[PDB]
Design a protein around this ligand. Sequence first.
Ligand SMILES: Cc1cc(O)c(=O)c(O)cc1C(=O)O
Ligand SMILES: [Mn+2]
Ligand SMILES: [Mn+2]
Length: 178
Amino acid sequence: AMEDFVRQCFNPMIVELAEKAMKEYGEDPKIETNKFAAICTHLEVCFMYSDFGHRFEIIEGRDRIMAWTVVNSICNTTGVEKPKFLPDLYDYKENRFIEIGVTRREVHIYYLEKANKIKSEKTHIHIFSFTGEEMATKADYTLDEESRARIKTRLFTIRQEMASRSLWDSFRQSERGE
Ligand SMILES: Cc1cc(O)c(=O)c(O)cc1C(=O)O
Ligand SMILES: [Mn+2]
Ligand SMILES: [Mn+2]
């Protein structure tokens, strides 16, 4: 049911990118169905965020070779510190990487996990929940209210579609994909 749900509510490119990523690391998306849904969800949010501005460089969704090529290449032309971990976007207006978090838990909680994981980076953090809460570094939310409203609407809709299908309770308790 969860596998059908994802093949039906995300566009084939997101599904294929997610499915490929899982199968390369030896994860079956027919088994790790919550993870599958989360990877698709987070991918879609990153694509939506980029699309609301050539203000953003999409790093998430690329193979590792291309992602590091995009990163090293931004760093050499801007001078900005090289992150330890692949972030999700680069913002050419504010001249900072963005790490995008999508969480079934509280936003402050997942914010802290992110901020701790990348403690020594100057990467901007933007957390979304499936409840329409966000939290971002210095309460700087990067996007305009409308672009953020679209993302929150899309995430709430995924939640409710999952609930229509009696999948939400599994998904929200499953913390995998975070
Ligand atoms: C959990 C995780 C979450 C992310 O938001 C992310 O952007 C990412 O690139 C990777 C992972 C991850 O599986 O390490
Ligand atoms: Mn990422
Ligand atoms: Mn992310």
